[PDB]
Write a protein that binds this DNA or RNA. Sequence first.
DNA 1: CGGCATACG
DNA 2: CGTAT
DNA 3: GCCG
Length: 327
Amino acid sequence: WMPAYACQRPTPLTHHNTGLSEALEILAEAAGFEGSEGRLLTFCRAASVLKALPSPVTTLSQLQGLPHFGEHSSRVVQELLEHGVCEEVERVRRSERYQTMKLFTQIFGVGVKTADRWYREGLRTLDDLREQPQKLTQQQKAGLQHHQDLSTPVLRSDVDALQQVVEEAVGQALPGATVTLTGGFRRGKLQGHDVDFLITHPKEGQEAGLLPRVMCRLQDQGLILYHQAFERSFCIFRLPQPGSWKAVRVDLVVAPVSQFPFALLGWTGSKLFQRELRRFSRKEKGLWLNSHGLFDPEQKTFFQAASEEDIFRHLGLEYLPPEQRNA
DNA sequence: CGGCATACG
DNA sequence: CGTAT
DNA sequence: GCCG
Ligand SMILES: [Mg+2]
Ligand SMILES: [Mg+2]
Ligand code: NA
């Protein structure tokens, strides 16, 4: 009943196995901190299966036949069901490695490889990194300076304000250009760690060179605390607050209208959903999918899409609205 | 055992 | 290397 | 870690 790919089943934002999925995603995260991408994927997939179930898992037998549940993930669920706690998961939670790798990788500009190297050098805290800025990039200096604000969840109320100011700058950079909210908020999330916008123009070609014009105007308005021709911009915005302001991460992306459906789909996520979707496309349909298009390698042609619905149809998948892509 | 998504800055 | 879903 |  439960299909093997996450793109084949609706996954709502809230579900009936929150505790179980959160435990497996701890192990997925820890696997990533050790470079085990395969293990991370299995744990992520197993967690997502539980998100797609219609009711709580209460007995171990209810895992039989579910894809991506083998000896390891089943044993985690078993201990949680019997004792409300999984020893392996708790061991990871309190490990010095896990805590520090999580703290470091959540810095903007710091990846697993950088965090791992710093950990091997004996570094453990944010103040450790501040004491030696000689080893920090300009991006990492920005992420570290703003780390506190960036750890504060972005609210849906904040998003509307940002979209307004982005549209204002986009409108002056290219009259007629549109701004579309993507990312987790388009999937219905009420909070997020950043805001994701997709920019296009209904006249193919007019979007060329647009993002530098948008960025220059945003900076001149004093709204850019940090930014790097280009089509993706990873910014830190100055977001007004009552009597003050806070730093917020904002991603801006431009696509020509011909590619807009593919870019909307990819940037709406979830991350797991897109990986599963591209995996499904290649392995089950022999088609190559990315945020630019869908390629048939046999005929050497690109599928034209006018909508996300078109893309699901060309992949033989039932359509899923953004709110059901929370894999 | 091979594979595990796929881009851009 | 970082970033993004 | 799990699937095919
Ligand atoms: Mg986001
Ligand atoms: Mg983002
Ligand atoms: Na990071």
